[PDB]
Ligand binder design. Structure first.
Ligand code: MG
Ligand code: MG
Ligand code: MG
Ligand code: MG
Ligand code: MG
Ligand code: MG
Lengths: 638, 673
DNA sequence: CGAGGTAGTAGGTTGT
DNA sequence: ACAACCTACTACCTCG
DNA sequence: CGAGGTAGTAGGTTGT
DNA sequence: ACAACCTACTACCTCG
């Protein structure tokens, strides 16, 4: 729309497949005893590896770039205690057409195993799977950091090796955990063994094993090396040069040749139009300019630092904000403490009885247990809450404004909105999350084309990442109803955003329900990884980049700051619907600017998805049982 | 303090253990390979069985009632085992640990000496000895379930309870070769794994691509499964651990798992019948095993006071409140939704409600929802308006629905804050019990207190906890009766959890909500709360909650309420009646809460007072009386005290419908009954 | 708990 | 088993 | 979906 | 493994 430009992907064209490689050998797999219908795939994958060479599962049997005579055609196989005896039978050679994508897939699996194999046969280089660390970045008392790249290798439809590369660093420890704290570093929150890779959370016995304290090795993180301060984010120009360097080094050293940089047509997307009361360039400006929509609100202060009132500068800033919005503000103070037990809960009930909408909490940094308990208790009285750490100087503007912003989203005000005009006037995001054996499936939405309302819905408990079909529809029905309650009508079109892959048929019911109500839709999968890197052929790297790729599949570079490192574009698939890709790309990129609780940095994900993700993250942390009396317009979880 | 009486338990006293038994033999175990620390206690269990004799696990090794020299001391199962005599260890039955091992021995002795009999069908600690009923292909056997352990006087105790067993003696092919329909469940003829049967398939066994390459027939044949059988026809069965994959199988390799639905034959016994039958079998067992003549054990039982149910006047059952008036009626509005295409309230339902509310001096408005679900969202809008006009609960007249549609409808109405009561619609006025219950359910769902107790209890707040739901995660939930009279029933939003254990913060939070409702209703904190747990109280589950109650100055009692494990109770003389309190140890007692002659032999609840200073008699009194508060069953009282029965029904429905619907539903409205 | 992404360190689910 | 995605955490740097 | 317990059938979690 | 508890289904029979 705003400029047809051109970019380099972090892929590289390498040599064509030789006519052998285009004609892999085929072996059929014979097992004794034959495996149960649930152990097939993990077993074929195993035989494929045991046979050695460059071999991959191809259907119900195997395909290899190695002639069968230099393969381990007979052997045995251990899985979950059971023992299977395999034998491979060569069945001639099937040529594969790289154009046909079915056949291209298997060629690409071969390609991947080749790279992995030829990587082993190198030195003196640290390799783990398809990653290789060919240099040293940093060292110290018992630790070193290696530099290298994670690689991948497949086959293009023109029949050539494509090679994906991305510079990466690796943290390696050189001491026993005793030998580690032979110098002053505390207990790492994770420890690994040198006798197995099986780590955990952290005298008679270990005797007979011939294996407590000198047997393991610490799993080193950045928290363990804060005290030593080098960083491992690369500026995008350095990352691109080191990408090319490494893509050539692998070209020769593995005999694949000259790395031809891969190029793609990108498009510059129109700039989004953020509005407070008037136009702003960042959500924090709404504190000076005024909010997009603002009603009469009452905030209350809760101090845990033993201090007395509203900090004056917070008070003024607040009146300035509400002054510019021409909305009436009243500031309350909770004169109570969580240590009074239920007396506290009474105090909260009365605050809310008197119109308080959210609570600002000044406190020293809290233990998560106390932090969580506090939040959850205020939630049970219908009060969302924003915490602001209490050694606080006015000079720390970015910290308190962001708190202020969060507090207001929590009280239910729309601080900013978009002023364009879009194909969908309801955009809803779905994530799953939660740090247990079950998860919460959940959803948040922007209602109105301007994004003039942000609501969450009560999540639902679920076994895995898949959201049950009726759940997907129900949460979606709640967002339509929110639209109905604000616009007095149904939306003509809904933009449905799912975090990650859309598991097979997950939205079948919902889509069918939309048709019946005559609501158009677009389902888009939004992938946070798998997009790779994008570099400008010439000039500078900027946001709003849209890269069409396959059909119904595109990259989208939504955020970039030339101080955070190389950005990582989202990868998006249009799963259902008939809106032109460019239009989805436009609306999603704009939705990225709608987030109210970050004053100075837009989120990589569009607002509905980012909110959804925070929502399920918080429910999973506090529990769902607290949320009955909390208004959906109040974004409690930001 | 009401008067005592004596009962017979279904236990029996047998002979004292002899000098030899009190001093079992100890053997240490060597295994090659060594056991992987997680897989070692099941292993010692295996060696103990393969050793032979009466031999069990005892901590690190084994204890035997056979001398080592007549045990299979060396063998293959970790695979190779060898056992080493390490002398004999005296055991003191007064020591609960040592008693625990004597008892493990006794069970093994029982199973072993049961094995050596003939001709009697034996499964674990059960024995079937006669033939109740048969049919071409199937037979139901009649025997009893037993257990045997050691008292602390050092003598055997036999427990006996009559039981029937349903057996299929035919393959699924031979079964269907009789005319018998499709058994809803089936089992492999080669292992104990069972499948849900979906249908038959036209397909050919010879040619059916099983994942991997094999077909159906060769796959089973390559395992020797058809060695001695016939493949039969293609069967389609269902995921044990998924929900998007029917699976091919072979009729000739399958056996039906027979249930009542697959067959005129009541298997419940009238209490006097079970009583004698128990005594026969006990005298028979004790004779055959050379354990002496069984003296049935007797226990002191105490009869509790008849609970006084209060409608607006006193009643003997909740349904009478429909004639006499409710405990506490408010101005209420109900709407009608007809899925039968008919219109208006059946006059007899209109009358009954009018009679009930007139007796209660409270006004009633009846609405009709002129909307239907197949309108889609316009139907939600109709609901939203109805809530807006004050409708509190909706009666739904409909043909028997499928669970999917039932569930969706109840959830939708829930999303507009409207509890519903379904009443199936071929409905004659003379079906008084069904529609009166429906009416009782409707009113509860609208938030009325239909009945309440009059009496004096230690706790003026009683809360029940349970976990349920049918997945890899469950809901931990709580329901409660507030006030001495329990004239306020409430639920709380349940919380998802991994298994049976409710997290400590959850327990407290749920408990806090019920304190909060008490505060809202009574203007103060409660003086004492009665905490009822369904099943056992997992170690420390209430630690945090109890600590919190203490800090707030609220007294408490924790009681574990166990639906099984309490055995049977019979009168020494006279008819058997409920309201029986039978203390066993300090802090543990039996409680017969409900019984009806026509409803077979009652199973009393087993209770354990886990914390609190309240006397057992008192707890028993309140718990027994709490059993009578339940408003949605007009003609028979639930076995559980109302707070737990409510909690159980709560978490069932939340599991069934999902918690996402509950946000706008008032906690006074008992939507799940 | 200020927030954002990019970096690193773990790990888990979907599904062929 | 393994590809191709997701979850959680801390440190770094700067403030569309 | 009428409700209750006791029957039968299947399965599971908690703790040693 | 095993002991001692829990969940779900449906048949039966009657209506504190
Ligand atoms: Mg996700
Ligand atoms: Mg997430
Ligand atoms: Mg926040
Ligand atoms: Mg339970
Ligand atoms: Mg239950
Ligand atoms: Mg009901």
């Amino acid at each position: 729309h705003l400029g047809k430009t051109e970019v380099f992907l972090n892929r590289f064209a390498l040599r064509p497949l030789n006519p052998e490689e285009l004609r892999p050998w085929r072996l059929e797999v014979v097992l004794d005893p034959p495996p149960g219908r649930e152990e097939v795939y993990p077993l074929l994958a195993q035989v494929a590896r045991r046979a050695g060479g460059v071999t991959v599962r191809m259907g119900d049997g195997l395909a290899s770039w190695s002639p069968p005579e230099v393969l381990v055609l007979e052997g045995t196989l251990a899985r979950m205690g059971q023992t299977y005896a395999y034998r491979l039978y060569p069945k001639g050679r099937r040529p594969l057409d790289p154009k046909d994508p079915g056949e291209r897939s298997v060629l690409s699996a071969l390609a991947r195993r080749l790279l992995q194999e030829r990587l082993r046969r190198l030195e003196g280089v640290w390799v783990e799977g398809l990653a290789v660390y060919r240099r040293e970045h940093a060292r110290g008392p018992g630790w070193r950091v290696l530099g290298g790249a994670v690689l991948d290798l497949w086959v293009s439809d023109s029949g050539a090796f494509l090679l994906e590369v991305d510079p990466a660093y690796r943290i390696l420890c050189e001491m026993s955990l005793e030998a580690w704290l032979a110098q002053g570093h505390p207990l790492p929150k994770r420890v690994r063994n040198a006798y197995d890779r099986r780590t955990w959370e952290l005298l008679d016995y270990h005797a007979s094993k011939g294996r407590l304290t000198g047997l393991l090795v610490p799993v080193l993180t950045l928290e363990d090396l804060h005290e030593e301060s080098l960083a491992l984010s690369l500026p995008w120009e350095e990352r691109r040069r080191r990408t090319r360097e490494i893509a050539s080094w692998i070209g020769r050293r593995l005999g694949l040749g000259t790395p031809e940089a891969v190029r793609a047509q990108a498009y510059r997307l129109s700039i989004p139009k953020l509005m407070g009361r008037r136009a702003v360039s960042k959500p924090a400006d709404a504190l000076r300019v005024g909010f997009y929509r603002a009603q009469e609100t009452a905030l209350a202060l809760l101090r845990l630092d033993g201090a007395q009132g509203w900090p004056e500068f917070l008070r003024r800033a607040l009146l300035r904000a509400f002054g510019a919005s021409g909305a009436s503000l009243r500031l309350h103070t909770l004169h109570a403490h969580p240590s009074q037990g239920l007396a506290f809960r009474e105090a909260l009930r009365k605050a809310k009885e008197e119109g308080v909408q959210a609570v600002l909490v000044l406190t020293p940094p809290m233990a998560w247990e106390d932090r969580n308990r506090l939040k959850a208790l205020l939630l049970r009285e219908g009060l969302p809450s924003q915490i602001l750490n209490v050694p606080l100087r006015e000079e720390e503007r970015h910290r308190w404004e962001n708190a202020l912003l969060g507090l207001l989203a929590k009280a239910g005000l729309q601080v900013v909105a978009l002023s364009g005009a879009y194909p969908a006037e309801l955009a809803v995001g779905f994530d799953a999350g939660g740090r247990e054996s079950f998860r919460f499936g959940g959803a948040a939405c922007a209602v109105g084309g301007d994004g003039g309302h942000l609501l969450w819905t009560l999540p639902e408990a679920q076994a895995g990442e898949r959201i049950p079909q009726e759940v997907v529809w129900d949460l979606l029905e709640e967002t339509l109803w929110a639209f109905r309650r604000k616009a007095g009508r149904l939306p003509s079109r809904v933009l449905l955003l799912r975090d990650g892959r859309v598991p097979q048929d997950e939205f079948a019911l919902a889509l069918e329900a939309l048709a019946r109500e005559g609501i158009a839709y677009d389902l888009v999968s939004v992938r946070k990884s798998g997009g790779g890197r994008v570099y400008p052929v010439q000039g500078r790297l900027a946001d709003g980049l849209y890269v069409p790729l396959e059909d119904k599949t595109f990259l989208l570079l939504t955020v970039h700051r030339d101080f955070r490192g190389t950005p990582r574009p989202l990868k998006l698939v249009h799963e259902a619907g008939d809106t032109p890709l460019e239009a989805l790309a436009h609306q999603i990129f704009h939705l990225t600017r709608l987030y109210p609780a970050s004053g100075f940095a837009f989120p990589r994900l569009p607002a509905p998805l980012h909110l959804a993700d925070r929502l399920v993250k918080e429910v999973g942390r506090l529990g769902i049982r607290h949320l009955k009396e909390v208004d959906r317009e109040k974004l409690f979880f930001v």
